[PDB]
Design a protein that fits this description.
There is one protein chain. The protein is an alpha+beta fold and about 350 residues long. It has a domain of about 200 residues: Transferase(Phosphotransferase) domain 1 (Transferase(Phosphotransferase), domain 1, Orthogonal Bundle). Helix content is about 35%, strand content about 15%. It contains 12 helices and 9 strands. Strands 3-4-5-7-6 form a 5-stranded antiparallel beta sheet, with no helix packed on it. A two-stranded antiparallel ribbon has the order 1-2. Strands 8-9 form a two-stranded antiparallel ribbon. A hairpin with a 4-residue loop joins strand 1 and strand 2. The radius of gyration is 22 Å and the shape is globular. One chloride ion (CL) binds next to loops. It is classed as transferase. The entry lists the keywords P38, mapk14, kinase, transferase, SGC - Diamond I04-1 fragment screening, PanDDA, XChemExplorer. The assembly is monomeric. PanDDA analysis group deposition Form1 MAP kinase p38-alpha -- Fragment N13619a in complex with MAP kinase p38-alpha.
Amino acid sequence: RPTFYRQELNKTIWEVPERYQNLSPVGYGSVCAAFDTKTGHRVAVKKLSRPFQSIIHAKRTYRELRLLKHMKHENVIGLLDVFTPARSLEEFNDVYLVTHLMGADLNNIVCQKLTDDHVQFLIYQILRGLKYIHSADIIHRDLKPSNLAVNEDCELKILDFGLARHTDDEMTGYVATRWYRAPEIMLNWMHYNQTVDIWSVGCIMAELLTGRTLFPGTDHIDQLKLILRLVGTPGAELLKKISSESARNYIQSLAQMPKMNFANVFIGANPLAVDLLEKMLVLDSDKRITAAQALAHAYFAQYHDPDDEPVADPYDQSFESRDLLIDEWKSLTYDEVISFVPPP
Ligand SMILES: N#CCC(=O)N1CCC(Cc2ccccc2)CC1
Ligand SMILES: [Cl-]
Ligand SMILES: [Cl-]
Ligand SMILES: [Cl-]
Ligand SMILES: [Cl-]
Ligand SMILES: [Cl-]
Ligand SMILES: [Mg+2]
């Protein structure tokens, strides 16, 4: 057990191992930047807020820790350390998580339009991380520019996985929290799968090429109209797959529209980028290109290396179907904290 020291930082008591120095607030939980004397990295340290205050909150704490312990990929957020000052389960109350310090997201780098070579490299890295995530049967569910960390060398990491249901008010109105969401999940058309993340990549790619949000709807229905104007109204094949009869009825109330010509929307763009966008932004989620397929698309010929695009170890999510008490979720979390093995 390392030696811990205490300090108060913006109305919060922090107790951390001596290896972490020069703590400075940067902003669920509270987050500080620090210097890790063991590895030489600048790191981000997150102290969880009220991790075991309800059943829902205890299960969410366990969910996040299981996920972060599993993700080991250059283009995905990973765990450098996890610790608690408690010396036993009976006194266990706080959880701290440590990862690399990531001070900028895709927004801060990019209302701006990038060169085609930058777009190739950034989207390639998102898809390389997604092939890894999807290989473990994980769905991110909330891909958007603010959830993509980028550094000075244009290197990218995916973070802030969907860990809980978003509130109804969070998704209301003219908000970027909804603009990158696949239509089938935005309107609850059907049981969704990993293809929802590819829709989000297409929205992000279009915005990097044009400098403009692709579907900036003022509400759910205005956004659906923007989407159907570009990709066309559904035919009977897709309508049958929409399980809600009321959502089916609404769609059939709309005047039919053909798919638009994407070369006349993304004027001047690389024709290979135009082709890839057509394969991502397909209304029927069964027919969208997968991450593994997209990495082999000719747009990425300068970066694609099939021997350097790894998959993940399998990931057991059976706990999601389990109903447990607060103290049981808390004891599972304690076990995962003390069994952590740091990376090389
Ligand atoms: N500067 C700044 C922000 C920053 O460095 N990033 C965004 C916030 C996350 C928080 C976090 C920490 C540990 C485990 C999971 C999540 C860290 C990376
Ligand atoms: Cl230490
Ligand atoms: Cl990381
Ligand atoms: Cl504690
Ligand atoms: Cl965003
Ligand atoms: Cl597992
Ligand atoms: Mg975020």
